Design a protein around this motif. Structure first.
Motif, PDB file in Angstrom:
ATOM      1  N   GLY E  88       0.768  -1.230   0.000  1.00 31.76           N
ATOM      2  CA  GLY E  88       0.000   0.000   0.000  1.00 31.76           C
ATOM      3  C   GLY E  88       0.803   1.286   0.000  1.00 31.76           C
ATOM      4  O   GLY E  88       0.252   2.359   0.256  1.00 31.76           O
ATOM      5  N   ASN E  90       2.495   2.288  -2.800  1.00 31.40           N
ATOM      6  CA  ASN E  90       2.134   2.824  -4.104  1.00 31.40           C
ATOM      7  C   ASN E  90       0.626   2.933  -4.282  1.00 31.40           C
ATOM      8  O   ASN E  90       0.136   2.927  -5.418  1.00 31.40           O
ATOM      9  CB  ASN E  90       2.735   1.967  -5.217  1.00 31.40           C
ATOM     10  N   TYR E  91      -0.112   3.025  -3.180  1.00 33.90           N
ATOM     11  CA  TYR E  91      -1.569   3.062  -3.219  1.00 33.90           C
ATOM     12  C   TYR E  91      -2.068   4.402  -3.748  1.00 33.90           C
ATOM     13  O   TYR E  91      -1.622   5.466  -3.304  1.00 33.90           O
ATOM     14  CB  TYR E  91      -2.111   2.797  -1.815  1.00 33.90           C
ATOM     15  N   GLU E  92      -2.999   4.345  -4.702  1.00 31.70           N
ATOM     16  CA  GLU E  92      -3.671   5.529  -5.242  1.00 31.70           C
ATOM     17  C   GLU E  92      -2.674   6.478  -5.920  1.00 31.70           C
ATOM     18  O   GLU E  92      -2.508   7.642  -5.541  1.00 31.70           O
ATOM     19  CB  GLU E  92      -4.478   6.234  -4.142  1.00 31.70           C
TER      20      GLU E  92
END
Ligand SMILES: [Mg+2]
Lengths: 147, 221, 76, 62, 98, 133, 244, 49, 49, 231
Positions: E88, E90-92
């Motif tokens: 998470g 590299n999330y969004e």
């Protein structure tokens, strides 16, 4: 009163010293005491030196100076004009913005040590991890083909 | 079922070697190889250049007369220097060159205990009007450390701090072979491939990693 | 009694605190005025803290812990 | 009228307020926002904004 | 980018300038913008990409300016990329870097 | 609080000081960017109480209907069942259909002349004027 | 860090469309120049990380700090004030993760067998810890169907009514469940005493579970369960193999 | 043509083909050590600052 | 309400409130009571103009 | 090469068989370095005894229903894999369990041969109805970690899953602690739940000894400067 070429200036350091004539009503209480006890000269000066702004730092790589003593043209009522050039080497950081050529932009959320990155079978660690969920819905599949 | 693990070396080049550890419990190979790889890529002692002083310059963002490269490019070239030091103390190397030619790392005179392992590495190219004179401080450290600014040191103006990439290991990988027979004797054989930067041998790097890991795991007692 | 040990700003669960008062705004002004009392007490040495404070505990956290222990009255 | 002057058609509202010699009772969250007064909603209503808080005697003893 | 205005042979090459002797005997020298500030604070730094003996043609690139490599627009870097989620971070649209 | 009901955020009964008006305005405006008479223009048409384009008049009183068929335009006359007098809705558009309303006998069908009409029945398809409602 | 402790700040992202566009947080010092934002508050802020910026406001008065800690605190506003539906809900990556974790794969590794012949049952485990041990080896798949003896999870409504009847299940009372180890690890995240959900976690089902946890449980327990689901879904999302 | 090129990718210095004809590869998790369960698309992308 | 009042009086244009706030924070005293926004005085003066 | 601030090992005892250890502070990166290694070592390297196979009387071809008892075969296998046993001799020792009276067969009704020990004699095993006869053989072996059922060659004997490991469930997590000016330092948190054969403290000490001896193989290649933190 000018910083020396090659100096590493920090947040708030003095770049160019400059004093301004001050009126006898602007003096602070601590200032009036020092002026009256010593009886200093009538040139009461306030510190208006050029200081480094917040979030700035680097090496002074150049200085340029213009004076009315020389034929240097200046606007009305300006005696001296000095420019200091400060250079900084910015490495990649958290919050910095990267983008491919297919509209795939994003900021750096985490810089991992070389040992944390997923690495190929021969030990080569990958350099950049792009999240999968971005590729299909943004309708830019060329970024995969380019890969 | 009991048999102590055995470590066998298997060299491939002067600066690359495999290491085999055969009798390990099943599922235990990947994690051990990975701990060794973490330690190798992280905390292997080495030596690199800390600061440099080039005669006739005060900061990185300038040129030297007669040199094709600028000071920034010269420092980027010096980044590739592999060097070893036994002094464990800030020592100084010198470099002087004149007239047309190609200043390479071989042109450096290291002091006692300091050795430069890639004499052919290109540094600069000088012409008729070119003269280069550089002092290079070499220190001994580990991991990676960014250039120490002249505020944290009593350093004067001419000194040019430089990033120090101390790690001497180059590339580490591992591979396990899982022998899972239909019988009860299953075991993984670990094969750790280590390549170093020609400053030390893979054997020495692995030994340093093993000492660090033993000292660390001795805490659970 | 089915929650883990809260961290930092949620030191008393918000629900147990909401039980002591009629609504959220009442609790807000409750704790605010108690914290003003505590800070005045600390500036004079006025009622001191009713529970043992932490090493450097903000007056608001002390007031919230006090309200959680039913050590204060409140008249709307 | 202060509330209406800040929404739309400031000129018309101000003219008609001057002619009708209007007087704003200054009751309404937007007007309190403008003048810097506790808005009459949430923690600003007199029910919550005026509360007497004092420790008990059983707690003053302990 | 610095471009040869006429064919010739490099007479001298320095980090400061590149001078080329033409065929008729005339010389042309090109100075190098070295660590120059742009309008937006980016750095314009030209580097010669020829050596002392080189013969260059008219229209050939002699020096590489900013965001140029051997005469081609080099606006970024070739990065080894793996397309996958990673804890998470590299999330969004966020990005993870070695 | 009891007439308002539950607070959507807190899940319990709404508290006293809550300015549910601003919460409602924000709840109505926030998803407005997704809308595509039309979409958001119709919302503005309603909230401003403007006389809608494509007006469908309604019936003033219970009575018998008489709809005169015309190629270019329609016309309607209502004779009240309460002993009243004729109400005249006229100049209807030929581009407007007729409301398919369930008559008093129970059978739903297209608007048929000579049949019973209640109070406020939508005379044609489209959107009715809320002032008339 | 001493003066920062328990002194809330306010984070805002324009356009502030609803009141959730401003939320109170407890600040922790971070190395770097970027604000770190919790991945669960992105739905309320409509925030992504394509270059977005946010603003920080520091309440000074005791009343302002109280309003931040009570009214505007992040973990106190989980539901949309417009529709009551959860907003601090597992989003795309966490969804993908939990969906992978709870899917049932027929014929996976270590799957249960009907025990036909001289060979008895094989996909049976005394505890979820034994299943974890079997998954350590290549023996058991996380999404493989098995039967487990559970002692710390509440059985479903029907199973609890049939195996325990009027006397409710109590922490410690074992029961046999026919599920996947992934669904056991999923239900370990949900609060103790929640009826076991033996399903493949679509986003709709997650929304339903959180709606129920809001309707019945305290707010703080929901704020903890969503964090547990966040961590689990992020762990299992990278190990799901979603790639283009 | 792009699909065809991924098949005849020259190997690394040790003679291993690291990227299959789907454009994916088996990566190890440098944190736990265990290999990631499924192959991941790796390649070289042009990234700008 | 109190946060809104503080943001709009002693953080923007209460010319005495901001200095009293600095003094109170430097001396650990309670934050003082908000004053009158200077922008409101300016609005009154513009209307009188 | 240099010296590092020595990490400390704190222990928090949740229950008598479950504990949480905290190793802090570690240099950045070493949290995950020690974590997975310690987890796998605790789970699959500590030697312990466990049940390997059983022979139940009255059923050798069917393996679905045991007459005279309430539980079936598979639940018996389950709650027998929970039996905590420790043996001295590294040979497959056999034990017997018999009971006739209508009641409950527990782990205290087993006759333990010399050299073996049952640590949870109060554990429930089965329920005998009126006229219920129970007679079952139990094979005990010393191994490591977890081994699935390896058979045949004689009817009535069924292999089971051997939970040799004296530890039961291990998890770990790496948090961020700050030494001074550096908020990225690592803090390892182990949560270990074991049987009652050895306490978590002894399991951790044994795993540490094992790993010390293991990386001693890499130590033995030379004597070179490395990270030193003792004292
Ligand atoms: Mg955005």
């Amino acid at each position: 009163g000018i910083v020396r070429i090659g100096a590493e200036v920090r947040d708030g350091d003095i770049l160019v010293g400059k004093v301004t004539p001050k009126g006898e009503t602007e003096l602070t209480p601590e200032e009036r005491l020092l002026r009256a006890i010593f009886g200093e000269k009538a040139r009461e000066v306030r510190d208006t030196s050029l200081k480094v702004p917040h979030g700035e730092s680097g090496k002074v790589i150049g200085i340029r100076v213009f004076s009315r003593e020389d034929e240097d043209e200046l606007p009305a009522g300006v005696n001296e004009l000095v420019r200091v050039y400060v250079a900084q080497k910015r490495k990649i950081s958290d919050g910095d913005k990267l983008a491919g050529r297919h509209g795939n932009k994003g900021v750096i959320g985490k810089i991992l040590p070389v040992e944390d990155m997923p690495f190929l079978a021969d030990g080569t660690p990958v350099d950049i991890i792009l999240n999968t969920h971005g590729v299909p819905r943004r309708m830019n599949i060329g970024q995969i083909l380019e890969t | 079922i009991s048999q102590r693990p055995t470590l066998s070396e298997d060299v491939l080049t002067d600066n690359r070697s495999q290491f085999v550890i055969e009798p390990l419990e099943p599922g235990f190979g990947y994690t051990l190889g990975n701990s060794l790889r973490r330690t190798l890529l992280s905390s292997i002692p080495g030596a690199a250049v800390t600061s440099i002083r080039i005669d006739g310059v005060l900061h990185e963002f300038t040129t030297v007369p007669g040199v094709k490269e600028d000071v920034t490019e010269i420092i980027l070239n010096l980044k590739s220097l592999v060097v070893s030091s036994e002094e464990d103390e800030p020592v100084t190397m010198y470099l002087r060159k004149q007239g047309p030619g190609e200043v390479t790392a071989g042109d450096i005179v290291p002091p006692a205990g300091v050795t430069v392992h890639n004499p052919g590495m290109h540094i600069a190219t000088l012409n008729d009007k070119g003269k280069l004179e550089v002092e290079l401080v070499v220190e001994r450290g580990r991991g990676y450390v960014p250039a120490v600014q002249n505020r944290a040191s009593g350093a004067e103006i001419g000194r040019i701090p430089v990033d120090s990439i101390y790690s001497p290991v180059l590339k580490v990988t591992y591979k396990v072979d899982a022998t899972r027979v239909e019988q009860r004797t299953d075991f993984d054989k670990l094969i750790l491939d280590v390549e170093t930067k020609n400053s030390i041998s893979p054997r020495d790097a692995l030994a340093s990693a093993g000492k660090t890991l033993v000292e660390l795991f001795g805490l659970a007692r | 009694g089915g929650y883990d040990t809260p961290l930092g700003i949620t030191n008393p669960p918000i629900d147990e605190l909401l039980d002591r008062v009629s609504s959220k705004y009442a609790l807000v002004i409750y704790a605010a005025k108690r914290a003003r009392q505590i800070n005045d007490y600390y500036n004079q040495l006025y009622v001191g803290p009713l529970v043992e404070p932490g090493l450097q505990e903000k007056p608001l956290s002390i007031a919230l812990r006090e309200i959680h222990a039913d050590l204060l009255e409140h008249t709307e | 009228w202060l509330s209406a002057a800040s929404f739309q058609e400031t000129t018309r509202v101000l003219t008609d307020a001057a002619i009708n010699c209007r007087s704003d009772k200054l009751n309404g969250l937007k007007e309190n926002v403008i003048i810097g007064k506790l808005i009459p909603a949430g923690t600003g209503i007199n029910r919550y904004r005026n509360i007497a808080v004092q420790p008990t005697e059983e707690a003053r003893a302990a | 980018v610095v471009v040869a205005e006429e064919s010739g042979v490099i007479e001298e090459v320095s980090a400061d300038y590149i001078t080329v002797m033409h065929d008729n005997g005339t010389r042309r020298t090109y100075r190098m913008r070295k660590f120059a500030r742009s309008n937006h604070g980016t750095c314009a730094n030209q580097c010669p990409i020829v050596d002392a003996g080189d013969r260059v043609e008219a229209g050939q690139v002699i020096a590489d300016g900013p965001c140029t490599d051997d005469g081609e627009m080099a606006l970024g870097k070739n990065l080894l990329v793996a397309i996958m989620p990673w804890e998470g971070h590299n999330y969004e649209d966020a990005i993870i870097l070695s | 609080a009891t007439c308002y009901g539950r607070s959507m955020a807190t899940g319990k009964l709404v508290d006293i000081g809550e300015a549910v008006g601003i919460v409602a305005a924000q709840s109505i405006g926030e998803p407005g960017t997704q809308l595509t008479t039309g979409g958001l223009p119709r919302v503005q048409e309603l909230f401003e109480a403007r006389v809608p384009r494509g007006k469908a008049p309604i019936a003033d009183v219970t009575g018998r209907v008489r709809l005169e068929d015309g190629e270019r335009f329609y016309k309607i006359t209502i004779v009240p069942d309460d002993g009243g007098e004729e109400v005249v809705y006229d100049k209807i558009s030929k581009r407007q259909r007729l409301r398919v309303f369930k008559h008093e006998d129970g059978s739903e069908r297209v608007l048929s002349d000579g049949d019973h009409v209640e109070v406020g029945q939508q005379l044609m398809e489209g959107s009715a004027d809320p002032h008339e409602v | 860090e001493e003066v920062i402790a328990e002194h809330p700040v306010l984070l805002n992202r324009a356009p502030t469309l609803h009141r959730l566009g401003i939320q109170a947080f407890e600040p922790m010092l971070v190395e770097g120049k970027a604000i770190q934002l919790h991945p669960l508050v992105c739905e309320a802020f409509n925030a992504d990380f394509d270059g977005d910026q946010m603003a920080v406001h520091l309440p000074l008065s005791a009343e302002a700090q109280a309003e931040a800690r009570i009214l505007m605190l992040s973990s106190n506003n989980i539901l949309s004030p417009a529709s009551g539906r959860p907003l601090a809900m597992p989003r795309l990556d966490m969804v993908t993760g939990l969906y992978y974790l709870t899917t049932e794969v027929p014929g996976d590794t270590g799957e249960y067998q009907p025990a036909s012949g001289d060979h008895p049952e094989t996909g049976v485990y005394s505890s979820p810890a034994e299943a974890i041990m079997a998954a350590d080896r290549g023996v058991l798949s996380v999404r493989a169907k098995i039967k487990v003896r559970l002692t710390q999870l509440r059985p479903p409504v029907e199973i609890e009514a049939e195996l325990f009847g009027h006397s409710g299940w109590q922490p410690g009372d074992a029961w046999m469940a026919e599920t996947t180890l992934g669904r056991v690890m999923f239900n370990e995240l949900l609060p103790l005493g929640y009826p076991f959900v033996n399903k493949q976690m679509h986003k709709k089902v997650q929304a339903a579970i959180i709606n129920d946890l809001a309707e019945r449980y305290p707010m703080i327990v929901v704020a903890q369960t969503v964090d547990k689901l966040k961590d689990a879904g992020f762990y299992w999302a990278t190990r799901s193999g979603v790639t283009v | 043509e792009l699909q065809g090129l991924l098949s005849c990718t020259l190997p690394n210095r040790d003679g291993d083909v690291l990227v299959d004809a789907d454009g994916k590869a088996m990566l190890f998790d440098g944190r736990s050590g265990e290999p990631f369960p499924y192959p991941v698309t790796v390649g070289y992308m042009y990234i700008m600052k | 309400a109190y946060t809104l009042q503080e943001l709009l009086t002693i953080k923007s244009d209460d010319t005495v409130g901001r200095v009293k706030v600095y003094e109170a924070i430097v001396k650990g005293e309670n934050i003082p009571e908000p004053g009158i926004p200077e922008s409101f005085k300016v609005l009154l003066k513009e209307l009188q103009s």
